Amino acid sequence: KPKLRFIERAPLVPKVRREPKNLSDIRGPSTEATEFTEGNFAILALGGGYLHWGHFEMMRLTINRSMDPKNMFAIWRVPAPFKPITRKSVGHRMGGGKGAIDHYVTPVKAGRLVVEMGGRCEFEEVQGFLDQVAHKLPFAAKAVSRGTLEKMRKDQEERERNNQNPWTFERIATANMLGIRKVLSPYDLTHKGKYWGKFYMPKRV
């Protein structure tokens, strides 16, 4: 059906063992689905972050409002929020054990498409309302097409060839040049210098 289905709060199988909040689930590029499938238009996440259910009800009710379902469709690329988040009730001293299970979230890494769209319309049509839903998200977003996304990678693959600065990040970081692996994380070899925690730096080679 050419509309985004109702994604629920609190998936109907409740997990009893609550998970530690590993923030390595946000770091760096997404190894998961980072290229289109049966859809030309999407909102690529240019930064990591957490998508609540309250984030989903914003995009599900704004895309469906501003789309003719006759000429367009829209598919998610993110699952239901599976990771539980623990909140202690405010007004307790620290400790006593890990608190109650409160609300569920899903981790979106950088470079991961969120909701893919397509149909008998162009990128300049969907740019009106996808840029609405872009800025409302808890990370740097940018609505890109297929022809708009792979422009950005030839930019980022010419800029690894074009720069005349003889010191790049990756030549210094993989070699431990000044003793620089002391300050750099062991992920800094692996991502590139282009990332910094949750935040992705696009202006950087």
Binding site: T174, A175, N176, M177, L178, G179, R181, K182, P186
Partner: protein
């Protein structure tokens, strides 16, 4: 964690372009080194504090010679950031027994065998 690093072996491989910049050539490599420490061992970990007593680089900016064999050369790979490695080149031959009274290093690394203080 921050642990002891290990460097993958495609940085200790020179291109043919690097022999245009530096003077060395891949045929006939240099027999001896000139190593001199240019950083303090302080704020560096204890392995990079104990190789420096192993090569004898305790007094900084004081040059030292070591073989260019790949057993010593692995030790220089750990403490490379502390040190300044230059090749030892000899304009003359080796100093024999009537020569070692008046020798000196001559920065640009020329172990000249006859050091007079007289002009040219």
């Amino acid at each position: 964690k921050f642990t002891r690093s290990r460097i993958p072996e495609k940085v200790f491989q020179a291109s043919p372009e690097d022999h245009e910049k530096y003077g060395g050539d891949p045929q006939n490599p240099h027999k001896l080194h000139i190593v001199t420490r240019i950083k303090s061992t302080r704020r560096r970990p204890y392995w990079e504090k104990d190789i420096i007593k192993m090569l004898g680089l305790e007094k900084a900016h004081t040059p030292q010679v070591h073989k260019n064999i790949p057993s010593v050369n692995a030790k220089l790979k750990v403490v490379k950031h502390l040190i300044r490695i230059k090749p030892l080149k000899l304009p003359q031959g080796l100093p024999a027994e009537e020569n070692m009274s008046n020798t000196c290093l001559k920065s640009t690394g020329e172990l000249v065998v006859q050091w007079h203080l007289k002009p040219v």
